[PDB]
């Protein structure tokens, strides 16, 4: 409805690393529910299992902790113990080659998952189409 329907090729069979081209960080969910990015490919918190709820709608779950990636009412990204409406993301292709993740709940506001150059997660309203922060590359684990 609010967005296009260009989808990336299937990547749910195996777990993946979500590499942000912005600052070259791997998305990470820490045990305490903290979300950020790290350049350390050896980190035990950067592996995710993605799954499709509906076509183009996914859950992003940490294989290490079982936490679900989510974005709160104030646009803050966090790790959820249980899956909820804040956990659904619209997985879309971007710039013909990357994957972008739009908060389903806040889709009309164009709130995306994104990482700054310093490895910090961006707040929902600070994200927008056109930024490098929103571009991810699913990499093999």
Curated annotation (Swiss-Prot):
Motif Nuclear localization signal: positions: 13-16
Would I find Iron among this entry's keywords?
A: no
Result of changing residue 39 to E? Dominant-negative mutant. Defective in integrin-binding and in ternary complex formation with integrin and FGFR1. No effect on heparin- and FGFR1-binding. Defective in inducing FGF1 signaling, cell proliferation and cell migration
GO terms assigned for molecular function: fibroblast growth factor receptor binding; growth factor activity; heparin binding; integrin binding; S100 protein binding
Q: Which proteins does it associate with, and in what oligomeric form?
A: Monomer. Homodimer. Interacts with FGFR1, FGFR2, FGFR3 and FGFR4. Affinity between fibroblast growth factors (FGFs) and their receptors is increased by heparan sulfate glycosaminoglycans that function as coreceptors. Found in a complex with FGFBP1, FGF1 and FGF2. Interacts with FGFBP1. Part of a Cu(2+)-dependent multiprotein aggregate containing FGF1, S100A13 and SYT1. Interacts with SYT1. Interacts with S100A13. Interacts with LRRC59. Interacts with CSNKA, CSNKB and FIBP. While binding with LRRC59, CSNKA and FIBP seem mutually exclusive, CSNKB and FIBP may cooperatively interact with FGF1.
* Purpose of the protein: Plays an important role in the regulation of cell survival, cell division, angiogenesis, cell differentiation and cell migration. Functions as a potent mitogen in vitro. Acts as a ligand for FGFR1 and integrins. Binds to FGFR1 in the presence of heparin leading to FGFR1 dimerization and activation via sequential autophosphorylation on tyrosine residues which act as docking sites for interacting proteins, leading to the activation of several signaling cascades. Binds to integrin ITGAV:ITGB3.
Name the chain's protein.
Fibroblast growth factor 1
Q: Which organism is it from?
A: Homo sapiens
- The encoding gene: FGF1
